[PDB]
Amino acid sequence: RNAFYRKLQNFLYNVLERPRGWAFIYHAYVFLLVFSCLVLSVFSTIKEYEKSSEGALYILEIVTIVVFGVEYFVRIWAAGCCCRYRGWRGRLKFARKPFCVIDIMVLIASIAVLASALRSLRFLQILRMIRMDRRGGTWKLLGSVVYAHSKELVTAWYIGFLCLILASFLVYLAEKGENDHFDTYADALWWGLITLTTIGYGDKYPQTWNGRLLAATFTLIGVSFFALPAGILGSGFALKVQEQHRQKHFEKRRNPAAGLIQSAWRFYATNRAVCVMRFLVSKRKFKESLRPYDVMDVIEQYSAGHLDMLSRIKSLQSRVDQIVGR
Amino acid sequence: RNAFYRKLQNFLYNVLERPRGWAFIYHAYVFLLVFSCLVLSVFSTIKEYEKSSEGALYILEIVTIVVFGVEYFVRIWAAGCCCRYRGWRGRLKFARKPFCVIDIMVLIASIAVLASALRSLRFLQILRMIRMDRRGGTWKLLGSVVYAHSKELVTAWYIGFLCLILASFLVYLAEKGENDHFDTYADALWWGLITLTTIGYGDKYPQTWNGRLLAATFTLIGVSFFALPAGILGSGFALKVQEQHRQKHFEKRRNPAAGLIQSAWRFYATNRAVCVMRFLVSKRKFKESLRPYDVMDVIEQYSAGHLDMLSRIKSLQSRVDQIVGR
Amino acid sequence: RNAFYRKLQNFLYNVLERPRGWAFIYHAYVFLLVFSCLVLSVFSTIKEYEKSSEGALYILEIVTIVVFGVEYFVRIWAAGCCCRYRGWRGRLKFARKPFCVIDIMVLIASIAVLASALRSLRFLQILRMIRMDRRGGTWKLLGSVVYAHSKELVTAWYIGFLCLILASFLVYLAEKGENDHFDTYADALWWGLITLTTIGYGDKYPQTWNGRLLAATFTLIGVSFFALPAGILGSGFALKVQEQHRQKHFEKRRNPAAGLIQSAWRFYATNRAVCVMRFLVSKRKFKESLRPYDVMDVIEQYSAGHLDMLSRIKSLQSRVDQIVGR
Amino acid sequence: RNAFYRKLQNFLYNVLERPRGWAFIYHAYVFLLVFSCLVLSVFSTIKEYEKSSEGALYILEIVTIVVFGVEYFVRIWAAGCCCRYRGWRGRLKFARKPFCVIDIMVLIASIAVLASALRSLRFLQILRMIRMDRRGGTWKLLGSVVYAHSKELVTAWYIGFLCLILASFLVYLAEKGENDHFDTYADALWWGLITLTTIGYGDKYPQTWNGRLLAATFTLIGVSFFALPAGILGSGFALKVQEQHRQKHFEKRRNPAAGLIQSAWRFYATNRAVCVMRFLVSKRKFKESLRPYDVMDVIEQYSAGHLDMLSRIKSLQSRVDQIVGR
Amino acid sequence: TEEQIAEFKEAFSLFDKDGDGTITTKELGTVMRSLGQNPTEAELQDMINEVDADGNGTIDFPEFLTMMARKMKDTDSEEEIREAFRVFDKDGNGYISAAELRHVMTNLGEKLTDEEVDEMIREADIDGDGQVNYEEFVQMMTA
Amino acid sequence: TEEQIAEFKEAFSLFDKDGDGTITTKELGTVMRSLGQNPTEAELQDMINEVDADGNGTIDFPEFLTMMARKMKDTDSEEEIREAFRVFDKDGNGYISAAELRHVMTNLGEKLTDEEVDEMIREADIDGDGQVNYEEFVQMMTA
Amino acid sequence: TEEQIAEFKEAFSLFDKDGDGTITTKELGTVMRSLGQNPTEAELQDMINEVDADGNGTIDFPEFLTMMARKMKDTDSEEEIREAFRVFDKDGNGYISAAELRHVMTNLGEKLTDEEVDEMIREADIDGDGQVNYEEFVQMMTA
Amino acid sequence: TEEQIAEFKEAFSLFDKDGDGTITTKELGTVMRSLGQNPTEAELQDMINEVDADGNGTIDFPEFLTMMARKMKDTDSEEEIREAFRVFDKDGNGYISAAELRHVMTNLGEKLTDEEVDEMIREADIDGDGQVNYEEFVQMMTA
Numbered sequence A, B, C, D: 001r002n003a004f005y006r007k008l009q010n011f012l013y014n015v016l017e018r019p020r021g022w023a024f025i026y027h028a029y030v031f032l033l034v035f036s037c038l039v040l041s042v043f044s045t046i047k048e049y050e051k052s053s054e055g056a057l058y059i060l061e062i063v064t065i066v067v068f069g070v071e072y073f074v075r076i077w078a079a080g081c082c083c084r085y086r087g088w089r090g091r092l093k094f095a096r097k098p099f100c101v102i103d104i105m106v107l108i109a110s111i112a113v114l115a116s117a118l119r120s121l122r123f124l125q126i127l128r129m130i131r132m133d134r135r136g137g138t139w140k141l142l143g144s145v146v147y148a149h150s151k152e153l154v155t156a157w158y159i160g161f162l163c164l165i166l167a168s169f170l171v172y173l174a175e176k177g178e179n180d181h182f183d184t185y186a187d188a189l190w191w192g193l194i195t196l197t198t199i200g201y202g203d204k205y206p207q208t209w210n211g212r213l214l215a216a217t218f219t220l221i222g223v224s225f226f227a228l229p230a231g232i233l234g235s236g237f238a239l240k241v242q243e244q245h246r247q248k249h250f251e252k253r254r255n256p257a258a259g260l261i262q263s264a265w266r267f268y269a270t271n272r273a274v275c276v277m278r279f280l281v282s283k284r285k286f287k288e289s290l291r292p293y294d295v296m297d298v299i300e301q302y303s304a305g306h307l308d309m310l311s312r313i314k315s316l317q318s319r320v321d322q323i324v325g326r
Numbered sequence E, F, G, H: 001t002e003e004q005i006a007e008f009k010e011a012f013s014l015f016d017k018d019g020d021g022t023i024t025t026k027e028l029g030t031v032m033r034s035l036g037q038n039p040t041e042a043e044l045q046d047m048i049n050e051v052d053a054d055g056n057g058t059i060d061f062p063e064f065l066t067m068m069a070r071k072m073k074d075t076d077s078e079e080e081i082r083e084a085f086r087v088f089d090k091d092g093n094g095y096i097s098a099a100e101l102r103h104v105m106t107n108l109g110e111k112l113t114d115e116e117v118d119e120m121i122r123e124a125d126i127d128g129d130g131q132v133n134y135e136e137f138v139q140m141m142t143a
């Protein structure tokens, strides 16, 4: 059953590691489980329901222990599919992966906690919550979209901060005496931040009509400047998704790769100028196909087609001229 | 008048079922009607206006019964236009449609209620409000746009939740003693959720300056992370609408369909390899026209044009070479 | 000086009617003026500053009357530039324009008011504020963008309304007894609307922990559904602006127009089948240039180029075949 | 070491003036420094921490003095890289730059303040904060995006203002008597502005059920109209960034420039019709490459290719016709 | 009238060379080539699409009479020519300058002989102001 | 059956001119050209991939028998034909008018002879209402 | 001057082969082909619109003299050449390296003979630092 | 070594037919055509760009020796080979099936003779599992 064993091992590795479809459902389950623990912790804080919260939390934590331990061991076993993790040394290197190290250490620390330990339990719960990512994908995506719009976010922050400072100062001037809310410029700054973000507690609000007019005038644009980052990032995310959907179809990374591997094999077997030159050529084509993944490839295709057709027309001209001479 | 009868029946079916233009106006009317009922129910809750609210609601409910009954019977009668619903069995199957079943059962339940029944009346009103969709179109559209951006929404939720947890914890630490609002970490979590969403009741707000500084620092990014989903989904919806408008014009689904039907007829009449293989080919063209509905078709068109042109140029080269040899 | 007189008249007509550049500055001035009046009216309401507000408002109103009267007469005079408004009958028809009628009638009503008249003054001020549009451009733009996204706005409203109703009902159930805020389902509906819009007065908020948990769970998605329309419309507006900028350059409406005018003149002079057929053809080209104004024209251009090149290649094939036969 | 000296001078000029990569890190540092000073000023306002805040602020201000002075002198020295600023007169002109003048004058004013001077210190701190831009880049970007969408923002403002006025008036009518919040129409206007922006202090809110219904009906659309500008500008910023990313690759500004410089040199050496006309032609090509930077260039490329191919086909037709005659 | 129908029949016979009452595109192309200009395949396909009222690629004589019955006023073609003129009215004042008018007539779209544009300046310029109008001009063509 | 396999072998030998059991694109092109129509490189290659179940560019006799084994009902080709007819059902009522049907057959897609469309009107029009149905029709082709 | 006008008239007669004062595109093409380089229809048409100040496709002698009245300083072409040089100034320091300069001259845009780039290096190297400037250089060309 | 430099000089002389030490693209094209297949203009220009380290369109002998000095391990081309194999690794398990491997070698990119792919299946398949690995394989090519 070695074939069936290998099939099962590959399926387990795929579901535990990067999944594609219904495999994600499993993760959801475990995620909910760990999420549940987190929620129960919060409930343990309320003294009204602390007893029942802790009673459920103990068994939920032990269940988390069992699930995470079995998942970790299954992941270690299923790491054999990839070549880089084979045998004692290979699987030891696999356990050397940062997230596998995090998983094993959190498992052991939680086990020890089972054997004021509550704070450690809460910290471990949040630690597993953050480890749920397992790849940094969310952070990578957010950082990419933010850095792409770094100039826009910076200008939004700069102008919004200037608006906040100026509006807070003017309202403070208009409300310094006739209102205890704006006793100090720090209070006015707190008010300005709370309003321009549109949180608006109501603990501080202008009461003098001059202050009200100034606050109206400034918030009317400050709220927009403060809401700008949300819109900028949302539009950036949507455009990134749309372009990913469009680029999902082209699949123009195939021929350069085959050429690259063939040329590398030929040059390796050579051991000459043509072989090495062609290897460099094929690597060049490989990476030049890697980069664009966009409409620049299409413009390159138009340029190639047009220049080729022009060359064929020049050949036509030569042929017709020579025929006329004949 | 069978021709006029059939024309009227088709018009009724079109207006009752999927309409296109001014037919929608009728739906608006009925929608308003049912909506009005819902509103009156709410007004019946206010003890100040309960008597008049119920007095109007009785007649409005009877009117709703009349309208829905006549509409249901007219829909059943007009279902004859489509072939699938003809005769006793055909119309029985039409009534087997899930939304027709819902309509008939809600009608029957409401009339029975007419003959603490108020709660059943409210539930039936909301039931007809939800049934007003009649197709799941809104749910389908929302699900499509959400699933398209599933990664973006998930990262937004993950980072926003981490920001919520961290900000609530830090503000709780900075306000645990000197403020009764943040008595328990659950209270701090409630505060964090209310502010980061920018609802900001003001029932809980930081009062210690350390708490105020921490809340400012964290909300300044938390509000953006919490507003992200709205912007992401709005941009996704707008882009989907724009691409639908663009794709509304191409109309490149005609020739493959004609080829498919013609080849299917030919293969049916065959009863051979050529006809069956051409039927498969025409089906292939049909589906391959079905899929793209986007610029990928245009890139395919460029590829086809370029390869055909190159073939013609090769033919030219052969001809000119042979003429030179001639 | 009739030439200079006509130049000045055309300049006045352009600045008063649809302007392009710095002409708009003039409008801003007058707009500010009328806007100022509106503001003063509000200030007249505050009894603390009623006397000074009214004292300034009388002068500002007389100034508004002077400015609007002189502007109206200058507009009537400058209407002579267009052919449709020439002479007694032409200028009478020009005054028949709906906004000119509104302007003259508001001017007359205001002067009469000058000779509880305050309410009429406020209504006239808001009337001139709305008339400031003079074309319906803002309403036309908003309606266009809304109707383009009608399906998306409708689904957003439907799902957000369902979320509002359900969340309000559940919070009402969880807070009916232990909180006087949610005394009646109408109060819960008011709370739900105020929170899901993120206005969050704080006059009503959940206080029972079950109510708080339910409110958190529901608002976390309700706020997004309620903020959706803003994002959808913002993205639609931005995309419309971007496509307008792109389409501003093509200017492919020239040759069809020249052909249309030439063919119309030829057919008029004919008084035959060729002339009328060409007139219809040129009108067809005119409208077909009118419609696309988008990338569909570009795809049509690709199709035309490809089919023409195919025809030339077929001629090539015929020529080479005949040469081979020769 | 003059070569190394010049390399260091150019590196210093690049990092101080427009940087590209890790040079920005330095700016961040100095920015934080100045920002820190600003924050300390706010802390000096709180009487609870005024003493420590001032004690740290004096040191931080002296540190800012040192850093800005050394940076200014290093910038003046490194200005030698550019040709326009060489020698006494060149560097004097460099100091004539508006931001260099601002820097030197703020440095001197701060030095003098070191030797109620607190207000001057705060104003100087905000002055250096604003001078941190050093180029107007943020203002330029915001103005560009705003002016591009001027029509959209104006319609949003107009419709939102009409909604604000109407909703405030109707709620005032429905709440004039039975609520002291809406004592005067100015109070109702303040309420309307605070809610439609979704700031929602809660200091004023409708309490009569007619007022609550009217407020619900109007805010349901007013909040969207007020949030529109944020979404419009966010989408505009995202689209601008996307188009900048796309246009970053084409790099089609090279050949026209080389032609322009070569033709200018030829025309200068001429001292004739051909050279001057070619100089004008090359300038024309230079600016015509400058303008599009968009897909209009691509449509021009398609037009050029198609017309060229058609010309080649006409030559083909002439050749084949003459061969047939031969 | 009887003579009107007779001349329409003569025109159709000259057009429909086949004589079966089913006029084809090639006949129109050939007769037009006789008239002087070469029509394109797309031009003729649009022509047949416009004239045809049945959808079989040929026009019967009654259809030809019906399309001939449409006069300048009857066709209600006013909006199209007005909007075309506004497209040319680069100033938008309701009048078009003689220089630009002649340049467009003789250099844009279908280049038009100097005789036709001379006739335009002759007839349309009732006022002779150079800023020749097009609304009254198109109105008198409609009449 | 034995005769069925014999006739399939005869057809394959006619197709696979080489006789080695590896039918190629050129053989399909030549045989179809014999049948009357010229096939394109894209057409023939797509034919080959659709028929092929191994991925070497040639089809063995067992694969040929397997593809012949699929009948109209077995292939479950219903959805495609129904949706194509709906695409043609410009009214969407479930019936297609005779005029539009004949126009599409004789003027769209693959040009179909008047005989085939005549056979369609003959067989599909069980009720003879002119508004021929495409559901019972496809049901009878499936059966 | 009188001799200036005489030589300009000689140049125009050489250009305007017709001699009617209406220089056409074909005349420029032919005379400059005699000068050596092959033009394009777009090239010569752009030439004509750039030189034309009337809008009829032909240039009269007064227009030719007027366009020749624009000297290097008068044309105010400073900004264009400065921005082009900045475009080449990949470092942006205000000086362009000699190697890159020669490479661009002899390998980019219009292929310029080694003699012209040699003249550039000769005249522009007032300081002879290799990192030739393009501001003082363009300044002396302006002067 | 001395013999290594001698054989490099022989190869360069066979390549640089001119013998002036400035190898041109045409010489590469001619010698390669001698080797059997035709190079394209873009192919050769990319080749010269990759090999050239000066920027004049010709390669001197020291540059040729320098580019020959780069070994498979020295070039550090590992990442490219691994990512290409992953691109082919449709399953991504670290191993590539023999059938897909041979199909890709003999049917994709540069058509590769059956001998080369046979050599791959021979040398690379140390374990002979059919699911041949590409990581250890590229390691041994690197070594």
Ligand SMILES: C=C(C)[C@@H]1CCC(C)=C[C@H]1c1c(O)cc(CCCCC)cc1O
Pocket: A219, A220, A221, A222, A224, A225, D146, D153, D154, D156, D157, D158, D160, D161, D164, D225, D226, D227, D229
């Ligand atoms: C630079 C921003 C953000 C724009 C443009 C400049 C001005 C005039 C307003 C901003 C703005 C609002 O801040 C709010 C609205 C909504 C209606 C406001 C009711 C008076 C529109 C609106 O354009």
Ligand SMILES: C=C(C)[C@@H]1CCC(C)=C[C@H]1c1c(O)cc(CCCCC)cc1O
Pocket: A161, A186, A189, A190, A193, B212, B213, B216, B217, B218, B220, B221, D035
């Ligand atoms: C670290 C973040 C995310 C932001 C952005 C970067 C900077 C330098 C500070 C944070 C920040 C505050 O933490 C506080 C304020 C205003 C003070 C509020 C009044 C008590 C502004 C302010 O941008």
Ligand SMILES: C=C(C)[C@@H]1CCC(C)=C[C@H]1c1c(O)cc(CCCCC)cc1O
Pocket: A146, A153, A154, A156, A157, A158, A160, A161, A164, A225, A226, A227, A229, B219, B220, B221, B222, B224, B225
């Ligand atoms: C990761 C997000 C969401 C961005 C980028 C990181 C930082 C510096 C801030 C966020 C942000 C705000 O959260 C708010 C504003 C508006 C003005 C704030 C006034 C200090 C701008 C602004 O870029």
Ligand SMILES: C=C(C)[C@@H]1CCC(C)=C[C@H]1c1c(O)cc(CCCCC)cc1O
Pocket: A035, B161, B186, B189, B190, B193, C212, C213, C216, C217, C218, C220, C221
């Ligand atoms: C089911 C929805 C829609 C959301 C998203 C998915 C998850 C697992 C829970 C919901 C949710 C809460 O229901 C509550 C909180 C915070 C607790 C609030 C403090 C009382 C976060 C939180 O994401």
Ligand SMILES: C=C(C)[C@@H]1CCC(C)=C[C@H]1c1c(O)cc(CCCCC)cc1O
Pocket: B146, B153, B154, B156, B157, B158, B160, B161, B164, B225, B226, B227, B229, C219, C220, C221, C222, C224, C225
């Ligand atoms: C259907 C909507 C609107 C999405 C998708 C479904 C779910 C899981 C949440 C919505 C949503 C939020 O409503 C809010 C956030 C911000 C962080 C929330 C903190 C727990 C993200 C976030 O995806």
Ligand SMILES: C=C(C)[C@@H]1CCC(C)=C[C@H]1c1c(O)cc(CCCCC)cc1O
Pocket: B035, C161, C186, C189, C190, C193, D212, D213, D216, D217, D218, D220, D221
């Ligand atoms: C006319 C507008 C613009 C909206 C949208 C269309 C519909 C039918 C009603 C309006 C509206 C309310 O006027 C009130 C509610 C909830 C009641 C609030 C609780 C007192 C929802 C609600 O959609």
Ligand SMILES: C=C(C)[C@@H]1CCC(C)=C[C@H]1c1c(O)cc(CCCCC)cc1O
Pocket: C146, C153, C154, C156, C157, C158, C160, C161, C164, C225, C226, C227, C229, D219, D220, D221, D222, D224, D225
């Ligand atoms: C002109 C705008 C802004 C649209 C279109 C007209 C109407 C019906 C509503 C607006 C709108 C909301 O203002 C709010 C929602 C969210 C749910 C509201 C709950 C009743 C949807 C929603 O389309």
